[PDB]
Design a protein around this ligand. Structure first.
Ligand SMILES: *[C@@H]1O[C@H](CO)[C@@H](O[C@@H]2O[C@H](CO)[C@@H](O[C@H]3O[C@H](CO)[C@@H](O)[C@H](O)[C@@H]3O)[C@H](O)[C@H]2NC(C)=O)[C@H](O)[C@H]1NC(C)=O
Ligand SMILES: *[C@@H]1O[C@H](CO)[C@@H](O[C@@H]2O[C@H](CO)[C@@H](O)[C@H](O)[C@H]2NC(C)=O)[C@H](O)[C@H]1NC(C)=O
Ligand SMILES: *[C@@H]1O[C@H](CO)[C@@H](O[C@@H]2O[C@H](CO)[C@@H](O)[C@H](O)[C@H]2NC(C)=O)[C@H](O)[C@H]1NC(C)=O
Ligand SMILES: *[C@@H]1O[C@H](CO)[C@@H](O[C@@H]2O[C@H](CO)[C@@H](O)[C@H](O)[C@H]2NC(C)=O)[C@H](O)[C@H]1NC(C)=O
Ligand SMILES: *[C@@H]1O[C@H](CO)[C@@H](O[C@@H]2O[C@H](CO)[C@@H](O)[C@H](O)[C@H]2NC(C)=O)[C@H](O)[C@H]1NC(C)=O
Ligand SMILES: *[C@@H]1O[C@H](CO)[C@@H](O[C@@H]2O[C@H](CO)[C@@H](O)[C@H](O)[C@H]2NC(C)=O)[C@H](O)[C@H]1NC(C)=O
Ligand SMILES: *[C@@H]1O[C@H](CO)[C@@H](O)[C@H](O)[C@H]1NC(C)=O
Ligand SMILES: *[C@@H]1O[C@H](CO)[C@@H](O)[C@H](O)[C@H]1NC(C)=O
Ligand SMILES: *[C@@H]1O[C@H](CO)[C@@H](O)[C@H](O)[C@H]1NC(C)=O
Ligand SMILES: *[C@@H]1O[C@H](CO)[C@@H](O)[C@H](O)[C@H]1NC(C)=O
Ligand SMILES: *[C@@H]1O[C@H](CO)[C@@H](O)[C@H](O)[C@H]1NC(C)=O
Ligand SMILES: *[C@@H]1O[C@H](CO)[C@@H](O)[C@H](O)[C@H]1NC(C)=O
Ligand SMILES: *[C@@H]1O[C@H](CO)[C@@H](O)[C@H](O)[C@H]1NC(C)=O
Ligand SMILES: *[C@@H]1O[C@H](CO)[C@@H](O)[C@H](O)[C@H]1NC(C)=O
Ligand SMILES: *[C@@H]1O[C@H](CO)[C@@H](O)[C@H](O)[C@H]1NC(C)=O
Ligand SMILES: *[C@H]1O[C@H](CO)[C@@H](O)[C@H](O)[C@H]1NC(C)=O
Ligand SMILES: C[C@@H]1O[C@@H](O)[C@@H](O)[C@H](O)[C@@H]1O
Lengths: 733, 727
């Protein structure tokens, strides 16, 4: 006799088995009018205008292929499709695979001059159907899918010389991509980077593999830890139109500016401006100085030249440059001008308009909020995402500013669905005629299509009504997004609150932390995660807090932990917990903390602080000492680990030094043994330190799991194990 | 009213006193008073300071050990000790003239020397350095380089590689001086095609990049090291020509395939015996090699070969036994399994195939301890048919039925486990009693076996112990299939059989193991019984040793079967004894014990609530070849692959859903690779089994660093207490 009251909760199995699924609407714009989508495994083509669709590629076309197809890529001219199979993951972005090209107008596979197995990367030219691929660390180009390839580079060498692909650090920390190949807009030129890792030390770890392997494998990866020798980089442009079968290809080198060549530096951004103009952004090893070169092709020479009067410098006196790297430029059509996000005089990131020949740029946006990204640029309008709306740093809306009058700024998403939608991202059609808006919260995700001419909504792509239907009688948690004031500054936090939240009660509280530089953990995003289960089923409040060092709020907050990681950011989580208890609905005896990666570091630093505030905590794949982490990320915030730079603080910010304070708390340390990112080493040293001072704690290694501990079975195992640990700690049955 | 606490165990509050002596002659031995080296006369009981602490104050290094040349004229001082594996280590050495009471500063033994030993007489010195053998005729003269093939991880001269060290010789050294020091026999090991186990060593926090340790280690069925044997005349060395080592080749019976050198024993000045063992360890051969005066060569008559083989298993307990030669070397005694499968002493004449057994019975000779012209002294478990007792016997060589027990009656209530150490010519012997009472060390004269005196009686420990509620020890047997199987129980103080106690089964259970005995111990179990009121039991089932081949060989080729089943059945019996809480039965073990613990927990028996496995083997293909193949044969379709694949803990993953499991393993375990637990953990994760875990960074198989040792026992205590609802 329940009278239809919601009696279900969001349980651990619901999360682990994905009972409640967020529907997505993932599309690929092929033109300015149409996009590809997946229905019941067939590749449909939709017409943005009307919404009429037809089948582009039936789900039976390749059922005789003989292998499982991981992904596909359609040539920009829509004449061929690249089929990806034998996918074998490497790091976060990299992987190898086999490829076959299917000709769409002959409905036939191409059996001649096939792309080799173990190919590291493949990319179509942006127009037409030329192919560039990397194999054995060398670059190859196919002008037509059925013709022999032209070998561009001959120096490729496993673990030493990389042409067209990155090494570990560049992939993970510099580019966020494996690809180091950049086609000119019309395909004439193929720009690439070459990395030399000759003297970069190798991290080595065991890989146990299937139980069949009698002897474990030692994995060895070139990986510069803080202060170690970094890979070097060279940049080249090759004219693909002048490739020859009788002569080797001529790659034209573009050298980094003299102000970079004086020392260690990085190539940090490549952006084509026009068919014959390419911009390159370089960053010094001490990451407070970057130079943007703008280089033009010379018809006579066949060379590329960068004019000093076109160099733009971007520096910082308070920290590093950019959120994680200097922003990318968005060039106007003629390539004589560009827009880009930079910190203004007050430390807020806003869009600056540069003329190619001029040092002084002018700001088209301003205010105490920040521009997240530039999404599209037309002749009349620039579209961007910002967190200006209602001054909520954790909110995201799409705006459009008239290039001819900066006072004319329109918000396109703010008011579409104000109660349901406050976190937007966008996907523009090939020439911005249309755009898809994706709102991730705080209500159920909603995907809509729009024409930009007069920004009316065309239709609802995905509204997650099915999920909405399932959730009706489930006691879901709510989210509170608000701020507290420390030293006259707003600091935002979020709390996942148990259903039927009652201020009169004292809830156990879990602090879910990340808190690295430019992080944001308090936002308007709707999530179905572990926190969802903890709040809904176990009545635990899960809070996150963005303190000093956090992003999207100006350099004053973000740069506060410069050269001093493991200080304010750690101190702030503690102060947040104190604040949370003073609110009156938190049980002081049951406050815990957990985090992954930087978050595991903070968790561990917090637990080893002697603050007495936290009963227990969980660190997953934590950094433990900055010298063990990679050079480009670490040194960005910590400078060099030398007596003449910042060695003292490197040594003062390790978790191992706080070992003794762990006697006051219950600690669960978790790490995957094949973590190529934060090495198991880091946790191995935390554990040895705890053992050395006689502190008891809980541990779990994950055989062959990497930084994401994302294998289906491992993912379920870790959240199960962490759930027991938290329940135990909080005396929950 | 205090109990024996975890801290007591961890901090060694109550220490067992020892009386470690080393004989120097037939009537004197050395002893170390905390601080001091004394010389004792065996006859009178009187000492004088032999080496005063202060002799080396000005040294400037910290001394690990010392070694007196047999003639008594020099003392080797060992320092800068750096442990390698179980027995192997590196160290620096200095030689001090005793009569001139000064350091030798000339032609010093190098730093990083791998092994050094004095000749059995005089003061010649042999050492191994950088995998090469060197000889020093006199402490202060250049050393002669015997071998030139030494090469790290590849060629080992005079020292063993990983597997020979751990599993064959139980020693780092592969050097054997003839009785009067004339000859230096040595083995050479070639590991060229032996695969390497690689694992990470994290080192001090200061190391930025972990180091990868790489060790030549043959896992089951892999390529093995090869071995060569050599003998060098140290009396005809030169300072001008290189020494010439005479090779003794293995017998043709061994040369037809993979084989091992398993025993080297000098019989006389010019006769050496070598035992060889086929890779399939059920066939071994003893060659007896004589020096040929006119040829400079060593010849082994095919007619003097002695074969020892087994039809039911491997040969020997862990390896063929060592022979004990009569003074003339034309005859010898060695322990072999008789026709009923019981290990007894057999008397061989060098020239004849058939030997005669001088002992017999349903009990076993543990070891031959000494032999004189008139008697053979040996240790056995004959006393009262108790396999876990040990007593010293002496057999009259002119009449084998004339057998005197020398220790059975010294103190029957307190002493039932003896070991012995005879003086250089058996004039005297020290008796070491290890239980069931407090260890008792006594000295005796072998002429009439009279007790000269009590060397250490542990009276101090006995007084301290009066204060603490100590647990007791019950040693008994149960009957399974008309056969006796022994078990022990450490029972809590004031034990009351009308009460239901939690029980922890402490298991090892490897082949020839013995966990039920009369030895007195102060260990983790003591604490659990005394403070936590937990019964900790151990059981010796099929596969266990010292009770004959029918029991020991029952697991031949079938590891992970009967020995596992018998631990479960034993637990079932214990619960039927009435004083066990059957909802609180746990099991734990280390190494082979971790394997059995895991196989038991993965058995679905439903008998055990929880368990702890420490450094367990998880699948036999991961373990070393010598130990593994000895019991399992080869992992190939034509041999025993099926059972190798059938006996893994990983295969029993799903059943772990019924128990609480704690898995612990040191990451620098060179013996049972961390790999073994990494595969267990992955298998449990794959079937969605939750369990507890703990890795120990940089710890090896003993997890024996002071802090790690304390930390593991503390962690395990919490787990068992949680499991048994003990706050
Ligand atoms: C340790 O064992 C090693 C391999 O079992 C052994 O190496 C082998 O040595 C021979 C002679 O130096 C090398 O080769 C020669 O003759 C054979 C014909 O039987 C040819 O195949 C070779 O080309 C060459 O002419 C082998 O190459 C070598 N095997 C290897 C290195 O794997 C060592 O000599 C042994 N060490 C000692 C001290 O005995
Ligand atoms: C990769 O980088 C290394 C330097 O880190 C280059 O090695 C130098 O090459 C020159 C010319 O042969 C040698 O004389 C030097 O000894 C090398 N330095 C070393 C090995 O440290 C190497 O040439 C580079 N390769 C490429 C293709 O750029
Ligand atoms: C793509 O861009 C290129 C560069 O702007 C265009 O072409 C000329 O570039 C080629 C390079 O091989 C030179 O050989 C020609 O000489 C260039 N121009 C002159 C005046 O000589 C090319 O036409 C563009 N393609 C498309 C389809 O627009
Ligand atoms: C063994 O090692 C020691 C220590 O390295 C050797 O001696 C040192 O040599 C340096 C000069 O190279 C001196 O400045 C040190 O003072 C020496 N240490 C000491 C304690 O004196 C020693 O000579 C080595 N060789 C042998 C055979 O032991
Ligand atoms: C004693 O034996 C060694 C090793 O066989 C001799 O030395 C090597 O001989 C080669 C030439 O055949 C030299 O190039 C090496 O430098 C020598 N050293 C080593 C460490 O192998 C040594 O000369 C021998 N000589 C005699 C004459 O018996
Ligand atoms: C030594 O052990 C081996 C293997 O356990 C015994 O051999 C047999 O092995 C051969 C070769 O692999 C097989 O073809 C036979 O089928 C096995 N069975 C039998 C009954 O022999 C060998 O007999 C043992 N030697 C001794 C002396 O017992
Ligand atoms: C949508 O209708 C137009 C009108 O003819 C047609 O050209 C187009 O092919 C249709 N869409 C698809 C996806 O085929
Ligand atoms: C790649 O591998 C497959 C199967 O291994 C083989 O049949 C094929 O011919 C190889 N080469 C290419 C280019 O796919
Ligand atoms: C291209 O370059 C490679 C290496 O530099 C060389 O071996 C090859 O001969 C060249 N090919 C031609 C056709 O010159
Ligand atoms: C870059 O950082 C270094 C070290 O903090 C400093 O010496 C230098 O002045 C910085 N550059 C700028 C422009 O602040
Ligand atoms: C100082 O101000 C910052 C914010 O600007 C605030 O987080 C902090 O708590 C104040 N406290 C300290 C401890 O310096
Ligand atoms: C900790 O910081 C102080 C300066 O506040 C520095 O002197 C000390 O050396 C640092 N710790 C380490 C381990 O260097
Ligand atoms: C031992 O005692 C005897 C007394 O008979 C004495 O002659 C001998 O030298 C003593 N020496 C030592 C070192 O005890
Ligand atoms: C040691 O034995 C050998 C027998 O060949 C002999 O030549 C040597 O001299 C012996 N020791 C002596 C006689 O002291
Ligand atoms: C019979 O064999 C042994 C003793 O010989 C015994 O331990 C075992 O439990 C009995 N039965 C079975 C089926 O193993
Ligand atoms: C495991 O053993 C059984 C028989 O005991 C056998 O049938 C099975 O095939 C064995 N393992 C393998 C890998 O074949
Ligand atoms: C050449 C072969 O191709 C097919 C597969 O069996 C393997 O990938 C191998 O490389």
């Amino acid at each position: 006799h329940h009278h239809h009251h919601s009696r279900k909760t969001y349980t651990l199995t619901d999360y682990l088995k994905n009972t409640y699924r967020l529907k997505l609407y993932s599309l690929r714009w092929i033109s300015d009018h149409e996009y590809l989508y997946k229905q019941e495994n067939n590749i449909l083509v939709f017409n943005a205008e009307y919404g009429n669709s037809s089948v582009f590629l039936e789900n039976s076309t390749f059922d005789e292929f003989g292998h499982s197809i991981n992904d596909y890529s359609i040539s920009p001219d829509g004449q061929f499709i690249l089929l990806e199979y034998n996918y074998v993951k490497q790091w976060r972005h990299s992987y190898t695979a086999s490829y076959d090209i299917y000709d769409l107008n002959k409905r036939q596979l191409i059996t001649e001059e096939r792309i080799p197995n173990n190919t590291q990367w493949v990319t179509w030219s942006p127009v037409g159907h030329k192919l560039a691929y990397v194999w054995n660390n060398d670059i190859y180009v196919k002008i037509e899918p059925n013709l022999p390839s032209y070998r561009i580079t001959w120096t490729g060498k496993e673990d030493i010389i990389y042409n067209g692909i990155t090494d570990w650090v560049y992939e993970e920390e510099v580019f966020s991509a494996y690809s180091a190949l950049w086609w000119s807009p019309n395909g004439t030129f193929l720009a690439y980077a070459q990395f030399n890792d000759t003297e970069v030390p190798l991290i080595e770890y065991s890989f146990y593999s299937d139980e069949s392997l009698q002897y474990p494998k030692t994995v060895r990866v070139p990986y510069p830890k803080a202060g170690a020798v970094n890979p070097t980089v060279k940049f080249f442009v090759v004219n693909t139109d002048s490739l020859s079968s009788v002569t080797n290809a001529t790659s034209i080198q573009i050298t980094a500016p003299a102000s970079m060549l004086i020392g260690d530096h990085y190539l940090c951004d490549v952006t084509w401006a026009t068919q014959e103009r390419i911009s390159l952004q370089w960053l010094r090893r001490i990451q407070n100085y970057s130079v943007m070169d703008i280089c033009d092709y010379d018809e006579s020479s066949g060379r590329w030249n960068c004019l000093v009067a076109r160099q733009h410098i971007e520096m910082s006196t308070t920290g590093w440059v950019g959120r994680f790297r200097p922003s990318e430029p968005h060039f106007t059509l003629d390539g004589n001008s560009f827009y880009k996000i930079i910190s203004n005089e007050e430390g807020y990131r806003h869009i600056c308009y540069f003329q190619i020949d001029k040092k002084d740029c002018t700001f088209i946006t301003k205010g105490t909020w920040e521009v997240i990204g530039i999404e599209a640029l037309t002749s009349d309008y620039l579209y961007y995402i910002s967190n200006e709306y209602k001054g909520m740093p954790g909110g995201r809306n799409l705006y459009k500013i008239q290039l001819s009058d900066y006072t004319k700024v329109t918000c396109l998403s703010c008011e579409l669905n104000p109660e349901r939608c406050q976190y937007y991202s966008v996907s523009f059609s090939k020439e911005a005629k249309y755009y898809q808006l994706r709102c991730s919260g705080p209500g159920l995700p909603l995907y809509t299509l729009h024409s930009s001419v007069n920004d009316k909504g065309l239709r609802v792509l995905e509204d997650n009504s099915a999920l909405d239907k399932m959730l009706q009688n489930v006691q879901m948690p709510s989210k509170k997004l608000d701020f507290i004031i420390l030293n006259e500054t707003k600091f935002w936090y979020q709390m996942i609150l148990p259903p039927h939240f009652d201020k009169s009660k004292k809830y156990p509280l879990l602090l879910d932390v990340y808190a690295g530089p430019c992080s944001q953990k308090a936002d308007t995003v709707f999530r179905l995660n572990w926190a969802t289960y903890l709040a809904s089923t176990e009545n635990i409040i899960v809070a996150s807090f963005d303190g000093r060092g956090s992003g999207y709020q100006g350099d004053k907050i973000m740069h506060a932990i410069n050269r001093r990681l493991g200080t304010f950011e750690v101190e702030d989580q503690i102060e947040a917990a104190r604040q949370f208890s003073k609110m009156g609905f938190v049980d002081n005896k049951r406050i815990a903390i957990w985090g992954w990666s930087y978050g595991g570091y903070v968790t561990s630093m917090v637990l080893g602080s002697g603050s007495g505030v936290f009963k227990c905590g969980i660190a997953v794949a934590p950094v433990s000492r900055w010298e063990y982490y990679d050079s480009v990320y670490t040194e960005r915030y910590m400078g060099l680990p030398t007596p003449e730079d910042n060695l003292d603080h490197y040594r003062n910010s390790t978790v191992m030094s706080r070992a003794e304070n762990f006697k006051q708390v219950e600690y669960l340390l978790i790490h995957g043994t094949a973590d190529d990112n934060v090495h198991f080493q880091q946790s191995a040293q935390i554990s040895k330190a705890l053992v050395d001072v006689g502190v008891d704690f809980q541990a779990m290694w994950y055989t062959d799991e990497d930084h994401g501990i994302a294998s289906s079975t491992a993912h379920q195992h870790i959240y199960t194990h962490m759930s027991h640990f938290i329940k135990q700690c909080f005396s929950l049955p």
